[PDB]
C-alpha cells in the first residue's frame, strides 16, 4: 500500500515558528536554522511511496526465534493512577476538556474519560482512531533538512496506551534481543559492548546501515508481526483485547488531521508519536537485519539496535568478499522494505563506525592508562546550545548532552563552561531543568552533575587528557566552521567559572572542583563521593 495518502490540507503550525536564531558561544548565526511546517511538503514527498515486501525462510526463522523468547515474558496491566503519573506535565492536552495537569492530579473528569476510552477500545477493534499531524521544530547547522513529521493521538488514548503496553515495551525487547538491544546500555556500557565485541573477532569488520525514512518502510504487516510478538507474552485477557484494538485502530494506520482539524489524509505506516514506536522500530529493525545477515552469509554477527539505527560487527571474509556480501545484505533489507539511505560500507576501525550519531574514541586518564569513551560530531549540540541560550525553551539538549557525552573534549570545555557561566550569572544553579534521555523526560538538578557523571563514567571522566588527533580535528574545525571561540579561550573562561563556583561551597564548589579540574594546571586529587538507561521511549510521551 501507499505509506501515506494526502488530501491537500496543509500540515499546519500551532503558533509562530522561528526559523532563525536571534553570541559569545557562536558568531555565524546564519548557519543555525530551525525546521518549520514550511518544509512540510518536501518531507511529504520524501516519505510517501508504495511498499513491496517479499519475505523468506530467514525472516520466518528469526521471527520464530523471536516469538520463543517473547513467550518467557509476563507483563502486567498498569493502573490509571500509574499511567497518569507517567504523563509529562506539558503533554499536549485533550480535545475532550482536560490537560496533562488534570491527568497527573487524578481529576475525576480526565480519569472518567480515560475509562470511557478504554471501554471503547475493548468493545470496538475496528474504527480507526484520530491522530494529529505536525511538523517538528528541530535545530540544525547548515549544510538543508525538511521538518520531520510527528504523528500522535489524543491524550486520553495515550494514557490507555500506557496502561496496556508500558510494561511490555519496558521489558520485552531486552528479552527478545538480548545484548543487541541498544537502550539497555548507558554510553559507557555501550562503548564496553562495542569495544569488547570488536576485540572478540579474529578479523573484525563493521558497518552501520542507515535505512531510508524508516517510519515509512514499516508495513501494516510489520505492525501486526509486532503485535503477534507482544501477544506471545503472558497477559491479562483485557490487555490482549486492548493491544489488539490499539494496533488495528492506531498502530497500523488511520486519519491525519492538522492543527485546524482539517483532514490531511491517511497513514499506513509507523506513527512517530505513539508508545510502541521505539520498541516497534527496534523489534522490526532487528528482525529484518538479522535475516539480511543470514541471507548475505555474514559470519558470526553481533548487532546493536536502537530503533531504526543499526550497527553490525562481524568476522571479515576479505575486503572484496566483504564489500560484496554487504550488497547482498542491502538487497535483502530492500526486499524486506528497509531500503538504504547512503549505501552501507565496510569499516575496519571501530573509531570510524558511526551508530546512534556517535562513535568510540580513546583518551588517557590521570595515571596515563588508555580509556575508551563515546563521542560525536559536536555541531548539532553546539547549534542547539546556541539556539537554547538565545530563545528560552523548556527543553535542554545541552544538559542531556553534558550527561551523555561528559567525557568528551567539547562537552567539558564548551558546554560545561558555558551554561555554568550562565547559571552562576543568573543565580539559577539550584533550579531543576528538564532533559531528554532515550526519549524519556527526567528533571535533573545541574548541581548533581558531578555524582551523575561519576556513576555513569567513573572518575576518569574528570581527568581525561590526551584525546586522539582525529577527534581534536573534528572539534577545532567544528569551531572554526561555526565561529565559536577556540579551545584556549574556553580554558580561560573555565578558570573564571571554576573559581566563582569554588567560593560558594557545597555542591557548587564540587561542580567547580570536578567539572573544571582539566583547566587549572596544578590538579587537585579527585576522590569519590537509576532506571535511566533501560529502554527507549522516544515518541511515547513518558516522564519519570
Ligand X SMILES: O=C(O)c1ccc(C(F)(F)F)cc1
Give the per-residue contact string, 312-351, with ligand X (x = CB under 6 A; - = no): ----------------------------------------
SS3 39: helix
Q: Does 404 interact with ligand X (rule: CB under 6 A)? A: yes
Give the whole-angstrom CA distance, residue 310 versus residue 280. 14
Give the whole-angstrom CA distance, residue 226 versus residue 459. 42
Show the cell assigned to 118.
Answer: 478504554
CB of 38 to ligand X, least distance (A): 25
Cβ neighbours around 345 below 10 Å, total: 13
Which member of 306, 334, 337, 417 binds ligand X (CB under 6 A)? 306
Q: Does 187 interact with ligand X (rule: CB under 6 A)? A: yes
Q: Does 535 interact with ligand X (rule: CB under 6 A)? A: no
- DSSP symbols for 50-69: B------HHHHHHHHHHHHH
CB of 284 to ligand X, least distance (A): 16
CB of 354 to ligand X, least distance (A): 10
CB of 250 to ligand X, least distance (A): 23
Which member of 166, 336, 438, 516 binds ligand X (CB under 6 A)? 438
* Short-list 372, 383, 370, 376, CA closest to 353: 376
Nearer to ligand X, 239 or 304 (CB): 304
What's the Cα-to-Cα distance from 298 to each of 56, 79, 189, 472, rounded to whole Å?
17, 45, 25, 34
Q: Does 358 interact with ligand X (rule: CB under 6 A)? A: yes
Q: Write out the binding residues for ligand X, residues 50-109 only, by CB under 6 A.
A: none
Q: Does 356 interact with ligand X (rule: CB under 6 A)? A: yes
Q: Does 374 interact with ligand X (rule: CB under 6 A)? A: yes
Nearer to ligand X, 71 or 174 (CB): 174
Q: Does 540 interact with ligand X (rule: CB under 6 A)? A: no
Nearer to ligand X, 6 or 532 (CB): 532
Nearer to ligand X, 219 or 408 (CB): 408
HSE toward the beta carbon, residue 531, CA cutoff 13 A: 9
Task: Name the DSSP class of 180.
Answer: G
Alpha-helical runs (H) found in 200-345: 214-217, 220-232, 237-246, 277-295, 319-335
CB of 478 to ligand X, least distance (A): 17
Which member of 58, 190, 267, 418 binds ligand X (CB under 6 A)? 190
SS3 189: helix
Show the cell assigned to 268.
Answer: 499506513
Show the cell assigned to 542.
Answer: 513518558
Question: Which residue, judged by CB position, is nearest to ligand X in the bound state?
Answer: 356
Give the whole-angstrom CA distance, residue 419 versus residue 7. 45
Nearer to ligand X, 265 or 536 (CB): 536
Q: Rounding to the nearest 10 degrees, give the CA dihedral for residues 396, 170, 541, 387.
A: 20
Q: Does 209 interact with ligand X (rule: CB under 6 A)? A: no
Cα-to-chain-centroid distance, residue 117 = 29
Q: Does 475 interact with ligand X (rule: CB under 6 A)? A: no
CB of 304 to ligand X, least distance (A): 9
Q: Does 353 interact with ligand X (rule: CB under 6 A)? A: no
Contacts with ligand X by CB under 6 A: the residue count is 10
Give the whole-angstrom CA distance, residue 221 versus residue 55. 11
Query: Which positions touch ligand X (CB under 6 A)?
Result: 187, 190, 306, 356, 358, 374, 404, 438, 536, 538
Amino acid at each position: 500500500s501507499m505509506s501515506y495518502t494526502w488530501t491537500g490540507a496543509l500540515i499546519t503550525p500551532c503558533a509562530a515558528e522561528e526559523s532563525k536564531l536571534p553570541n559569545s558561544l557562536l558568531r555565524h548565526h546564519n548557519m543555525v536554522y530551525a525546521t518549520t511546517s514550511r518544509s512540510a511538503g518536501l518531507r511529504q514527498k520524501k516519505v510517501t511511496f508504495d511498499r513491496l515486501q517479499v519475505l523468506d525462510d530467514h525472516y520466518r526463522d528469526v521471527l520464530k526465534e523471536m516469538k520463543a523468547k517473547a513467550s518467557t515474558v509476563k507483563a502486567k496491566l498498569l493502573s490509571v493512577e500509574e499511567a497518569c503519573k507517567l504523563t509529562p506535565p506539558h503533554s499536549a492536552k485533550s480535545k475532550f476538556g482536560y490537560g496533562a495537569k488534570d491527568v497527573r492530579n487524578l481529576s475525576s473528569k480526565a480519569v472518567n474519560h480515560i475509562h470511557s476510552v478504554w471501554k471503547d477500545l475493548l468493545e470496538d477493534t475496528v474504527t480507526p482512531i484520530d491522530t494529529t499531524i505536525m511538523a517538528k521544530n528541530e535545530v540544525f547547522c547548515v549544510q538543508r533538512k525538511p521538518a520531520r513529521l510527528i504523528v500522535f493521538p489524543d491524550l486520553g488514548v495515550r494514557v490507555c496506551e500506557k496502561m496496556a503496553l508500558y510494561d511490555v515495551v519496558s521489558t520485552l525487547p531486552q528479552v527478545v534481543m538480548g545484548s543487541s538491544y541498544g537502550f539497555q546500555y548507558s554510553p559507557g556500557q555501550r562503548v564496553e559492548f562495542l569495544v569488547n565485541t570488536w576485540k572478540s573477532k579474529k578479523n573484525p569488520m563493521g558497518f552501520s546501515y542507515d535505512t531510508r525514512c524508516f517510519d515509512s518502510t514499516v508495513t501494516e504487516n510489520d505492525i501486526r508481526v509486532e503485535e503477534s510478538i507482544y501477544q506471545c507474552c503472558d497477559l491479562a485477557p483485557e490487555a490482549r483485547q486492548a493491544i489488539k484494538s490499539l494496533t488495528e485502530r492506531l498502530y497500523i494506520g488511520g486519519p491525519l488531521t492538522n492543527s485546524k482539524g482539517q483532514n490531511c489524509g491517511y497513514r499506513r505506516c509507523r506513527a512517530s508519536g505513539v508508545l510502541t514506536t521505539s520498541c516497534g522500530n527496534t523489534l522490526t529493525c532487528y528482525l529484518k537485519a538479522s535475516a539480511a545477515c543470514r541471507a548475505a552469509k555474514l559470519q558470526d554477527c553481533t548487532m546493536l539496535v536502537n530503533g531504526d539505527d543499526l550497527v553490525v560487527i562481524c568476522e571479515s571474509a576479505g575486503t572484496q568478499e566483504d564489500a560484496a556480501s554487504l550488497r547482498v545484505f542491502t538487497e535483502a533489507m530492500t526486499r524486506y522494505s528497509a531500503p538504504p539511505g547512503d549505501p552501507p560500507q565496510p569499516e575496519y576501525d571501530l573509531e570510524l563506525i558511526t551508530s546512534c550519531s556517535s562513535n568510540v574514541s580513546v583518551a588517557h586518564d590521570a595515571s596515563g592508562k588508555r580509556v575508551y569513551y563515546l563521542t560525536r560530531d559536536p555541531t548539532t549540540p553546539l547549534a542547539r546550545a546556541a539556539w537554547e541560550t538565545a530563545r528560552h525553551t523548556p527543553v535542554n539538549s545541552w544538559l542531556g548532552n553534558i550527561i551523555m557525552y561528559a567525557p568528551t573534549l567539547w562537552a567539558r570545555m564548551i558546554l560545561m563552561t558555558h551554561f555554568f557561566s550562565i547559571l552562576l550569572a543568573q543565580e539559577q544553579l539550584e533550579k531543576a531543568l528538564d532533559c531528554q534521555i532515550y526519549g524519556a523526560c527526567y528533571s535533573i538538578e545541574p548541581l548533581d552533575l558531578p555524582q551523575i557523571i561519576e556513576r555513569l563514567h567513573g572518575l576518569s571522566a574528570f581527568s581525561l587528557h590526551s584525546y586522539s588527533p582525529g577527534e581534536i580535528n573534528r572539534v577545532a574545525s567544528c569551531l572554526r566552521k561555526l565561529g565559536v571561540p577556540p579551545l584556549r579561550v574556553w580554558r580561560h573562561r573555565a578558570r573564571s567559572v571554576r573559581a566563582r563556583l569554588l567560593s560558594q561551597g557545597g555542591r557548587a564548589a564540587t561542580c567547580g572542583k570536578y567539572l573544571f579540574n582539566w583547566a587549572v594546571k596544578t590538579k587537585l586529587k579527585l576522590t569519590p563521593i537509576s532506571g535511566w538507561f533501560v529502554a527507549g521511549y522516544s515518541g511515547g510521551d513518558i516522564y519519570h
